[PDB]
């Protein structure tokens, strides 16, 4: 109907049964809206854990990007949705995915002061030396913003990774 919710809205609102019906009726599990967003991106952005799980189980593509090169991972990282980040990482996504701003999942996790997400990303190979468009990396951001626990996590990771310093 004219006022029926889109697949993106069903996913964002946690309407599991209606979403399951819709994706059976039409091939819309990866359908992109006017901003390029998939149902997975809407679910991830709204912290809908059960819907993210359901979409991934049903084969939704977690690697797709919106018109601004937004990814489900970066959206979840920016909001600190640790369990959704874990599911997406378990899928196999690019942990260093760049958007049109030069942002990456780690940079968003650092910006939001989401230490569990920062830890998880680093464990999955996120590179804290990748820079924004203005040339600042994750370490630079953690320092600038005074997020000390985040800074510690990043610095300890780098100390272990670097083989020129013991």
């Amino acid at each position: 109907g004219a006022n029926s919710l889109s697949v993106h809205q069903l996913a964002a609102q946690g309407e599991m049964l209606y979403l399951a019906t819709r994706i059976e009726q039409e091939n819309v599990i990866n359908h992109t809206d006017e901003e390029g967003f998939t149902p997975l991106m809407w679910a991830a952005a709204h912290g809908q854990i059960a819907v993210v799980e359901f979409l991934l189980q049903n084969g939704a593509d977690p690697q797709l990007l919106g018109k601004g090169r937004e990814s489900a991972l970066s959206l979840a990282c920016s909001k600190g949705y640790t369990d959704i980040v874990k599911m997406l990482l378990d899928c196999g996504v690019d942990v260093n995915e760049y958007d049109w701003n030069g942002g990456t999942p780690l940079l968003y996790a650092v910006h939001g002061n989401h230490v569990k997400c920062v830890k998880m990303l680093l464990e999955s190979g996120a590179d804290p030396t990748i820079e924004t468009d203005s040339g600042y990396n994750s370490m630079d951001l953690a320092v600038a913003l005074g997020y000390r626990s985040v800074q510690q996590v990043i610095e300890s990771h780098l100390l272990k990774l670097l083989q020129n310093i013991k």
Binding site: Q13, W42, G103, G112, D140
Partner: peptide, 17 residues
């Protein structure tokens, strides 16, 4: 009704715009 909170990533820049 629909949510108007469309997915968005924040501005993460430092220094002046």
């Amino acid at each position: 009704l629909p949510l108007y909170t469309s997915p968005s990533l924040p501005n993460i820049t430092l220094g002046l715009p």
